[PDB]
Structure formats: structure tokens, C-alpha cells
Design an enzyme around this catalytic site. Structure first.
Site, short mmCIF file in Angstrom:
data_model
loop_
_atom_site.label_atom_id
_atom_site.label_comp_id
_atom_site.label_asym_id
_atom_site.label_seq_id
_atom_site.Cartn_x
_atom_site.Cartn_y
_atom_site.Cartn_z
N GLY A 1 1.81 5.86 9.91
CA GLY A 1 3.21 5.77 9.46
C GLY A 1 3.92 4.60 10.09
O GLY A 1 5.03 4.32 9.65
N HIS B 1 0.85 -1.24 0.00
CA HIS B 1 0.00 0.00 0.00
C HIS B 1 0.88 1.28 0.00
O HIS B 1 0.31 2.43 -0.05
CB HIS B 1 -1.11 -0.04 1.08
CG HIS B 1 -0.68 0.15 2.51
ND1 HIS B 1 -0.92 -0.81 3.49
CD2 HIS B 1 -0.09 1.19 3.15
CE1 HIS B 1 -0.46 -0.39 4.65
NE2 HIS B 1 0.05 0.85 4.47
N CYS C 1 3.27 1.62 9.68
CA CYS C 1 3.10 0.50 8.74
C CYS C 1 4.48 0.05 8.32
O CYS C 1 5.31 0.94 8.09
CB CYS C 1 2.29 0.89 7.50
SG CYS C 1 0.62 1.57 7.81
C1 UJ1 Z 1 1.00 3.05 7.20
C2 UJ1 Z 1 -0.18 3.50 6.89
C3 UJ1 Z 1 -1.09 3.95 7.97
O1 UJ1 Z 1 -0.62 4.54 8.95
N1 UJ1 Z 1 -2.42 3.63 7.86
C4 UJ1 Z 1 -3.10 3.17 6.64
C5 UJ1 Z 1 -3.43 1.89 6.17
C6 UJ1 Z 1 -4.10 2.08 4.94
C7 UJ1 Z 1 -4.72 1.07 3.97
C8 UJ1 Z 1 -4.44 -0.36 4.45
C9 UJ1 Z 1 -6.24 1.31 3.91
C10 UJ1 Z 1 -4.18 1.23 2.53
N2 UJ1 Z 1 -4.20 3.39 4.71
N3 UJ1 Z 1 -3.58 4.03 5.74
C11 UJ1 Z 1 -3.28 3.86 9.06
C12 UJ1 Z 1 -4.69 3.20 8.93
O2 UJ1 Z 1 -4.82 1.98 8.75
N4 UJ1 Z 1 -5.73 4.06 9.07
C13 UJ1 Z 1 -7.10 3.70 9.42
C14 UJ1 Z 1 -7.55 3.84 10.75
C15 UJ1 Z 1 -6.69 4.40 11.86
C16 UJ1 Z 1 -8.86 3.45 11.02
C17 UJ1 Z 1 -9.71 2.98 10.04
C18 UJ1 Z 1 -9.25 2.85 8.75
C19 UJ1 Z 1 -7.94 3.21 8.41
C20 UJ1 Z 1 -7.46 3.07 6.99
C21 UJ1 Z 1 -8.57 3.12 6.03
C22 UJ1 Z 1 -2.76 3.42 10.42
C23 UJ1 Z 1 -2.12 2.20 10.58
C24 UJ1 Z 1 -1.73 1.79 11.83
C25 UJ1 Z 1 -2.01 2.60 12.92
N5 UJ1 Z 1 -2.63 3.79 12.81
C26 UJ1 Z 1 -3.01 4.18 11.57
#
Ligand code: UJ1
EC number: 3.4.19.12
Length: 304
Positions: A143, A41, A145
């Protein structure tokens, strides 16, 4: 004496964390030999996250569209493959700090240490369990991830987890290092439900053994029970049922304390059916399922 949630020393993993940048998305990656593993991603923009086509998205990117950085070192990407939900970047330089390592898919109820990172830098280390429903109750901001989970066996680092996302409920989902999700989750910003979580019965028993060892014996009772009888009470309380393999794994703790597994099971039953009643065990007012029998023995024997 004493008992803590102990993490593995993070030294060997610290030397493999790098920052990975594609377009304006930055996250952590893992640099082993001449390959950087990271969540795929990285190649999504915010638009893309609702319904990404990873194949059409990846076909637009070249080797030079990826910026891997290790501290102030830039690495040159010379190959790139997608393996399920991870991206492999082939770099020009093998990591001088690469440890003895395996990749392992773990089973629910197993514990590991997470090194939480932001822009390829370590921020902290914590121990946790893979929940029966294949989520983790972690501590992760935007971040984080590409932060990994790991166990150590002597000089060998076993990588078991790469963090991909937080669910709308606030728990955490990720992959093995071959890019297979633990659980039924997709790397898509859509509503996903984890199953009902259960309590890891074998780990609760291991923690009770740890308690006896460290002086805390109040909850021990005269009663005993059957496995069958015990499992009936466990189910009504959303506990994992106890198999003979679970009995076999607790034998050492049993032998060391001279308390039969089933006698310990009878003690547990009584706590389920009456609660703690404003008492504590190893200074917790709840039953703790985040130590395995292996963890209790390492900690109570002094394994380095
Ligand atoms: C590293 C990326 C990141 O921090 N996050 C993330 C994951 C994604 C997808 C898998 C959808 C491509 N996009 N961004 C967030 C995250 O997952 N954000 C999030 C939250 C907090 C709640 C509901 C939905 C979503 C994404 C749609 C992240 C990851 C870990 C910890 N905090 C935030």
C-alpha cells in the site's frame, strides 16, 4: 557538532498526499495543481499483475471509476491519461497547498528523503541513496505505492521518485514523476534481477570528511596515492571508480579540512585492504555511502 542521517522536513509534501482508489486497489497519489499522479498499477486486480495489458485495462475505466480523496474531501476526476508507468488524473480542484516544485530525474549515488504513506496518510520520513543498480533499500509495506522521494532547494520541492514495487530480493523500484522506471524494471509481477550493486566511492569520501570535521581522525595516515592506483584497489572491492568531476565536487571539504582528496583516497585504500579492525567512524563499524558531498556541507554549515 554531531552527524545524523537527516531527512528534509516533510511539511510541503504532506499537503500533496491523497488516497487513490480504482475498483478495490487503493494506493497513494500526489496532488499538484489540478492533477493527481499515481502508479498506473492502481487499475490492476490481483489476476492482472502477472502479465497486465495496461492499454486494454485502461480502456475499460472511466473518469467516475476513480476515487481520489484528500483527508475527508472527495475530488472529482474530469480527465485521465497514462504517461509511461504513471497515471495522470485531472481533477476539478487545484490543491491550495501546492508547493513550488520541479520534477527531476536523479542519477545513481544521489540521496533524497522518502515520505512513506498508507491510504494517502504520512507514516514516517527517511533519507536514502539511489543505488548504482537503480534500486533503493527502503522501508515499505503493501500500500506504500505512490510514496514519493523529494529534495528541497530553499522553498522548491524537487520530486525525484515514485515507489512502484518491492523485488523478490526485498529492495525497492520506482519511477521518476514522468513514469520512467529507474533501472531495467517493469510494473509486472515477474522475476526481475537488479545488477551487482557497487559502493558509491565519492559519498564514502564525503563521509570521511564529515568524520574529520567532527573529531574522528584515527584512520588518517601518512601515505598518499594516484587516482589510477586508487581505482585499481576500488574495483577489486566493488567500489565505483573515481573521476576528476568527483575530485572537483570534494574540493570544498578538502579546503575546509586542509586534506587533499588523494590523501583521503590513500586513507580509504588502507581501510579497504585492512578493514576497521573493531574501530568505528561516526559510530559506524562500516563505510557509509548514503551521504553526498552536498549533504555533508548542508549538515556541517546549517542550511535551511
Ligand atoms: C502498492 C502496491 C504494493 O504494495 N505492491 C505491489 C506492486 C505490484 C505490481 C508492480 C506487481 C503490479 N503489485 N503489488 C507490493 C509488491 O510489490 N509486492 C511484491 C513483493 C513484496 C515481492 C515480490 C513481488 C511483489 C509484487 C509481485 C509492495 C510494494 C512495496 C512494498 N511492499 C510491497
Amino acid at each position: 557538532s554531531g552527524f545524523r542521517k537527516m531527512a528534509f522536513p516533510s511539511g510541503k509534501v504532506e499537503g500533496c498526499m491523497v488516497q487513490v482508489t480504482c475498483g478495490t486497489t487503493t494506493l497513494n497519489g500526489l496532488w499538484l495543481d489540478d492533477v493527481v499522479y499515481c502508479p498506473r498499477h492502481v487499475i490492476c486486480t490481483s489476476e492482472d499483475m502477472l502479465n497486465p495489458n495496461y492499454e486494454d485495462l485502461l480502456i475499460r475505466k472511466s473518469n467516475h471509476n476513480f476515487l481520489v480523496q484528500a483527508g475527508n474531501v472527495q475530488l472529482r476526476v474530469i480527465g485521465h491519461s497514462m504517461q509511461n508507468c504513471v497515471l495522470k488524473l485531472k481533477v476539478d480542484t487545484a490543491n491550495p497547498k501546492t508547493p513550488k516544485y520541479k520534477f527531476v530525474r536523479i542519477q545513481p549515488g544521489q540521496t533524497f528523503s522518502v515520505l512513506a504513506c498508507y491510504n494517502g496518510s504520512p507514516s514516517g520520513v527517511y533519507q536514502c541513496a539511489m543505488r548504482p543498480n537503480f534500486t533503493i533499500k527502503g522501508s515499505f509495506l503493501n500500500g506504500s505505492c505512490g510514496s514519493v522521494g523529494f529534495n528541497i532547494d530553499y522553498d522548491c520541492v524537487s520530486f525525484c521518485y515514485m515507489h512502484h514495487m518491492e523485488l523478490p530480493t526485498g529492495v525497492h523500484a520506482g519511477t521518476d514523476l514522468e513514469g520512467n522506471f529507474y533501472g531495467p524494471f517493469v510494473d509486472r509481477q515477474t522475476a526481475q534481477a537488479a545488477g551487482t550493486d557497487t559502493t558509491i566511492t565519492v559519498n564514502v569520501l564525503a563521509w570521511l570528511y564529515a568524520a574529520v570535521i567532527n573529531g574522528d581522525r584515527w584512520f588518517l595516515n601518512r601515505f598518499t596515492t594516484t587516482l589510477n592506483d586508487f581505482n585499481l584497489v576500488a574495483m577489486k572491492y566493488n567500489y565505483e571508480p573515481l573521476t576528476q568531476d568527483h575530485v572537483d565536487i570534494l574540493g570544498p571539504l578538502s579546503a575546509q579540512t586542509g586534506i587533499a582528496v588523494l590523501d583521503m583516497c590513500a586513507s580509504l585504500k588502507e581501510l579497504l585492504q585492512n578493514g576497521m579492525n573493531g574501530r568505528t567512524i561516526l559510530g559506524s563499524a562500516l563505510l557509509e555511502d548514503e551521504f553526498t558531498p552536498f549533504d555533508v556541507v548542508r549538515q556541517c554549515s546549517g542550511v535551511t
